[PDB]
Design a protein around this ligand. Structure first.
Ligand SMILES: [Ca+2]
Ligand SMILES: [Ca+2]
Length: 195
């Protein structure tokens, strides 16, 4: 299984790069490093500059969008151009369960679709399966200056997977918990504490 971890997120509402955020005494980048090291993983940075700073800190595969694309779409595209189909996971979700990812990848591959994205009332694109066949539409969006993943997804054959079908792998669906604002760090802390 191939995993592309999006770590180029710049913590705006938290006043510090996401990678540096301290979760239970450990940086977020070290959280995902540990969690995904067992797989065929690449960490997608916002630019080569970040890749250089992280790679001099950790022995892992750090890549970036060749044509300096910005945002999530550019990060996913970069991963697809690097090694093909994979499951994407943002660093913003430090509690993702590998079982959940494994399922998404397998189901995504067999389904024969451009992307398999978890969904309740709204989809969660940064925690889904993307096949290589989805790269062109994503790249067109990047070149057209479109930073709304929903736009290129409409031009692709997407399979929206009921988030409920994932509870068998994740009881509380904690895999979907995102850290973006002050109230999240407070909760994130309580969660990693009870663990
Ligand atoms: Ca092509
Ligand atoms: Ca939140």
């Amino acid at each position: 299984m191939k995993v592309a971890v999006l770590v180029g997120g710049v913590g705006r509402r938290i006043g510090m790069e996401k990678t540096e955020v301290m979760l239970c005494g450990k940086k977020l980048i070290e959280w995902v490093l540990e969690k995904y090291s067992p797989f065929q993983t690449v960490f997608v940075c916002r630019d080569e500059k970040q890749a250089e700073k992280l790679s001099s800190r950790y022995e892992a595969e750090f890549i970036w969008d060749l044509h300096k694309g910005v945002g999530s779409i550019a990060g996913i595209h970069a991963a697809l151009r690097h090694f093909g189909s994979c499951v994407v996971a943002a660093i913003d979700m430090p509690f993702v369960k590998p079982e959940v990812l494994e399922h998404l990848y397998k189901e995504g591959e067999k389904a024969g679709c451009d992307a398999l994205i978890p969904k309740h009332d709204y989809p969660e694109p940064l925690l889904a399966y993307y096949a290589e066949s989805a790269a062109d539409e994503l790249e067109r969006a990047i070149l057209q200056g479109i930073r709304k993943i929903l736009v290129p997804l409409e031009r692709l054959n997407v399979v929206y997977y009921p988030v409920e079908k994932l509870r068998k792998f994740d009881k509380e669906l904690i895999s979907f918990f995102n850290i973006n604002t002050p109230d999240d760090l407070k909760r994130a802390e309580e969660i990693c504490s009870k663990m």
